[PDB]
């Protein structure tokens, strides 16, 4: 309802932004993820893989590799990275290498999912979301980006369906 | 000349620029005004992401045009 009124603006094909203001825990359960540099892929794994464990992220990194070989050359955010495909893959696959919005875009296409990354301010509230894919918040795989450096998984609270 | 930039939080800021400014220069100005690191910034105009080494002029970005700023988020 609040969640049904989100206003997404498609800024570039397949990528949308929204600036609602809410307390994350009013609408979502946070499913905390470990770091060791892998928390982006752990968060994806939590929401896409049945029986997820602390090893599941390796599967998501392989799908990211597959995705990159199809999509990396044409990803707008890849222009920021500025690496050849092969150098990009070498870095991405490195142990503890951070994931990002670039991998979210490629994974949304590879996995056939919508990924939303909600970013939180120092005041604790969500101030913006970036969405990769056309699905709504109820269909999407929702991630929480915090401390400018960490991803956790989110699940919508049951009373909002 | 003044242009506008709508940030990821939906704040629309003014920026002082020259038509000859590269996108890299514009990112530095946003850093100076808003504190956003240049490596995070993706600037978008007319549904296309702008390239670092091109100028506002290269893109037909005029006085009072509005750019969208989207962030590269890592973790």
Swiss-Prot record, chain A:
This is RNA-directed RNA polymerase L. Displays RNA-directed RNA polymerase, deubiquitinating and deISGylase activities. RNA-dependent RNA polymerase is responsible for replication and transcription of the viral RNA genome. During transcription, synthesizes subgenomic RNAs and assures their capping by a cap-snatching mechanism, which involves the endonuclease activity cleaving the host capped pre-mRNAs. These short capped RNAs are then used as primers for viral transcription. Interacts (via N-terminus) with host ISG15 (via C-terminus); the deISGylase activity of the viral protein interferes with antiviral signaling pathways mediated by NF-kappaB and IRF signalings. Interacts with host ubiquitin. It comes from Crimean-Congo hemorrhagic fever virus (strain Nigeria/IbAr10200/1970) (CCHFV). Changing residue 150 to A: Loss of deubiquitinating and deISGylase activities. Changing residue 15 to R: Complete loss of debubiquitination activity. No effect on deISGylation. Unable to block RIG-I-mediated gene activation. The chain holds residues 2 to 162 of 3945 of the full protein. Belongs to the Bunyavirales RNA polymerase family. The active site is at residues 39, 150, 152. Residues 1-27 are annotated as: Essential for the vOTU enzymatic activity. Residues 28-157 form the OTU domain. Changing residue 39 to A: Almost complete loss of OTU proteolytic activity. Unable to block RIG-I-mediated gene activation. Classified as His(+) endonuclease since it has a histidine upstream of the active site that coordinates the first cation. The viral OTU domain (vOTU) and its N-terminal extension is responsible for ubiquitin and ISG15 binding and for the deubiquitination and deISGylation activities. The gene is L. Transmembrane segments: none annotated. Disulfide bonds: none annotated.
């Amino acid at each position: 309802d609040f969640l049904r009124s989100l206003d997404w603006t498609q800024v570039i094909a397949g990528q949308y932004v929204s600036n609602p203001r809410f307390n994350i825990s009013d609408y979502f359960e946070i499913v905390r993820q470990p770091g060791d540099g892998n928390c982006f892929y752990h968060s994806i794994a939590e929401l896409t893989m049945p029986n997820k464990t602390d090893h599941s992220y390796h599967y998501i990194k392989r799908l990211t590799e597959s995705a990159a070989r199809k999509y990396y050359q044409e990803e707008p955010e890849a222009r920021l990275v500025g690496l050849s495909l092969e150098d990009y893959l070498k870095r991405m696959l490195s142990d503890n290498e951070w994931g990002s919005t670039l991998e979210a875009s490629m994974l949304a296409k590879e996995m056939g999912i919508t990924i939303i990354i909600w970013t939180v301010a120092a005041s604790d509230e969500v101030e913006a979301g970036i969405k990769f894919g056309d699905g709504d918040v109820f269909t999407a795989v929702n991630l929480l980006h915090s401390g400018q450096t960490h991803f956790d998984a989110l699940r919508i609270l049951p009373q909002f369906e | 000349m003044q242009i506008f930039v709508k940030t990821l939080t939906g704040k629309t800021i003014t920026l002082e620029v020259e038509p000859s400014d590269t996108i890299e220069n514009v990112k530095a100005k946003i850093q100076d005004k808003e504190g956003i690191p240049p490596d995070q910034q993706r600037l978008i105009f007319a549904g296309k992401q702008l390239e670092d080494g091109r100028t506002l002029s290269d893109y037909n970005i005029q006085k009072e045009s509005t750019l969208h700023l989207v962030l590269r988020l890592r973790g």
